[PDB]
Amino acid sequence: FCIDLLIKLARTMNFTYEVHLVADGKFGTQERVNNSNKKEWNGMMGELLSGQADMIVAPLTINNERAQYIEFSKPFKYQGLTILVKKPEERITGINDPRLRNPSDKFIYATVKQSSVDIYFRRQVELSTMYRHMEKHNYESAAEAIQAVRDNKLHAFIWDSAVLEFEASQKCDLVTTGELFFRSGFGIGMRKDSPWKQNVSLSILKSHENGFMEDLDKTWVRYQE
Amino acid sequence: PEERITGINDPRLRNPSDKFIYATVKQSSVDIYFRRQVELSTMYRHMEKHNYESAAEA
Amino acid sequence: FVDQVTGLSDKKFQRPHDYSPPFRFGTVPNGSTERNIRNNYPYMHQYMTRFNQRGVEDALVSLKTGKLDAFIYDAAVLNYKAGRDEGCKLVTIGSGYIFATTGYGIALQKGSPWKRQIDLALLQFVGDGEMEELETLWLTGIC
């Protein structure tokens, strides 16, 4: 998806590029390094601010803490949150299940290790019990969560909507939940005040106004299996 | 057919019409308690056209 | 829950002469939706030129009584109007799948120093469920 988006951007503007990857499977969280008592970053934020990278082209989670340090562009993806289950009420109907408010060793809900959903639930102090429950089952990548929920080791997984809808198109046993909360947007990770801000945002808005988003849906999103 | 309403959380009572006729006693403390509620001004504007003298009239 | 029109790429949205009743649909006058149509399909504006209207409530009465078949408007306002409609006769189309699916921001002038504080306040309002509480208060997604 984002590869062809970058190809469209290179067709639009006057630049070449250099695609590389990140050393881990983590977005990047602010944590105290053990020396000098200082909070530092890692992941894509740790590699972008180090000068080794130029532009995070990734579905980056837009929140309050990241915008305090870097600048943002217009979001391209717009989706909410949902729960991956396997198909008596086998469904969960979102966060409002009372059996998940006070959890146990039966209903296994988890998330990605060092994800922005963990920080988003860490700010929410009214559900700290879920913060103390997902810490025992933090997985490195979402593919590990898919492999564990296919082998019936997991029971629930907090994740974005359209990715799990695409995986439900891949495998029919994958079922999303009913509640659609935190309808947020994902954009392109950017630097500070730069000449690649206004032109690139106008190019993104030009991609929004036409049916090129529908063409990108025809590539992967709208097509089902 | 839903003969029950189950309280204030009926969305049809949030935006009423000429069908669901609901009111209270004129100059009652229930109207003052709803007047403190600054998020139910629609019911305050709706029930003022049908307030009765006594509850036996209702 | 049947769906006649899937979206903007419908076969109905090429020419209503293809079907035996010629249906009709219009937009709001002097609107940015008209500008988006004229930058997307000028022939759609040519077929809408005979199908113009004035009032949003007038278009609502035209859809209810039968003086208009379909109406192109924004998404969430029609979602709020359908969430308070008597009987829920009019049915929306999807959730913006074959549509623009844009967002609303706050317009500031070029060079205003207030932009960063407003952005931090908006990220504070979204990142605690208070925006979700306001959307629960001012929207009702029934039917």
Cβ <8 Å between C142 and B39? no
A110-144 burial, b at 16+ Cβ within 10 Å, e below that, comes to bbbbbbbbbbbbeeeeeeeebeebbeebebeebee
At position B45, the amino acid (one-letter code) is R
CB atoms within 10 A of CB C39: 12
Chains B and A touch (3+ CB pairs under 8 A): no
Pairing of strands C25-26, A85-86: unpaired
Q: What's the CA angle centered on A185, arms A181 and A189, to 5 degrees?
A: 140
At position C55, the amino acid (one-letter code) is G
Question: Distance between CA atoms of C56 and C73, rounded to whole angstroms?
Answer: 9
CB atoms within 10 A of CB A5: 17
Residue C125's nearest CA partner among C135, C137, C115 is C135
Q: What resolution, expressed in A, was reported for this entry?
A: 4.1
Question: Distance between CA atoms of A62 and C123, rounded to whole angstroms?
Answer: 9
Tell me which residue in C40, C127, C129 faces A63 most closely, judged by beta carbons.
C127
In angstroms, the Cα distances linking A222 to A9, A22, A163, C5, C111 are 22, 28, 12, 16, 41
| Cα torsion angle, C129, A163, A59, A28, sign | positive
Tell me which residue in A67, A123, A211 faces C128 most closely, judged by beta carbons.
A123
Tokens of A140: 């490195």
Q: What 3-state class would DSSP assign to A82?
A: strand
Residues of A with Cβ-Cβ distance to C8 under 8 angstroms: 211
Pairing of strands A77-83, A156-160: antiparallel
What single DSSP character describes residue C65? H
Assess contact for A187 and A62: CB atoms under 8 A: yes
Which spans in A90-197 are helix H? 98-101, 116-123, 128-131, 142-150, 161-170
Cβ <8 Å between B11 and C86? no
Assess contact for C127 and A121: CB atoms under 8 A: no
Say whether residue C86 is in contact with chain B using an 8 A CB cutoff. yes
Residues of B with Cβ-Cβ distance to C141 under 8 angstroms: none
Cβ <8 Å between B11 and C83? yes
Residue A27's nearest CA partner among A111, A115, A112, A110 is A115
Question: Distance between CA atoms of A168 and A113, rounded to whole angstroms?
Answer: 23
In angstroms, the Cα distances linking A51 to A3, A23, A46 are 22, 15, 9
Residue A215's nearest CA partner among A8, A10, A56 is A8
Question: Distance between CA atoms of C112 and C94, rounded to whole angstroms?
Answer: 38
Method of elucidation: cryo-EM
| Cα torsion angle, A1, A23, A156, A183, sign | negative
Residue A188's nearest CA partner among A197, A176, A178 is A197
Who contacts C71 (Cβ-Cβ below 8 Å, separation ≥6)? C25, C26, C27, C59, C62, C63
Cβ <8 Å between B39 and C83? no
Containing A39, the helix (H) or strand (E) segment is: strand A38-40
Half-sphere exposure of C15 (CA within 13 A, CB side): 2
In angstroms, the Cα distances linking C106 to A72, C43, C61 are 15, 32, 32
Burial of residue A168 (CB within 10 Å: 0-12, 13-18, 19+) is: middle
Assess contact for C120 and A72: CB atoms under 8 A: no
Who contacts A164 (Cβ-Cβ below 8 Å, separation ≥6)? A82, A84, A174, A176
Tokens of B33: 């308690």
At position A25, the amino acid (one-letter code) is G
Say whether residue C84 is in contact with chain B using an 8 A CB cutoff. yes
Who contacts B22 (Cβ-Cβ below 8 Å, separation ≥6)? B13, B16, B43, B46, B47, B50
Question: Distance between CA atoms of A169 and A30, rounded to whole angstroms?
Answer: 35
Residues of C with Cβ-Cβ distance to B17 under 8 angstroms: 86
Residue A64's nearest CA partner among B44, B45, C121 is C121
Who contacts A69 (Cβ-Cβ below 8 Å, separation ≥6)? A45, A49
| Cα torsion angle, A73, A77, A83, A88, sign | positive
Residues of C with Cβ-Cβ distance to B37 under 8 angstroms: none
Tokens of C90: 């009019």
Backbone angles phi and psi of C15, in degrees to 5: -160, 125
- DSSP-assigned beta bridge partners for residue C71: C26
Number of helices (H) and strands (E) in chain A: give both, helices first.
10, 9
Query: Is C74 annotated in some ligand binding site?
Result: yes
Say whether residue C18 is in contact with chain B using an 8 A CB cutoff. no
Question: Distance between CA atoms of C75 and C94, rounded to whole angstroms?
Answer: 10
Query: Is A59 annotated in some ligand binding site?
Result: yes
Backbone angles phi and psi of A157, in degrees to 5: -155, 115
Residue with tokens 């504007």: B45
Pairing of strands A156-160, A109-110: parallel
Assess contact for A158 and A81: CB atoms under 8 A: yes
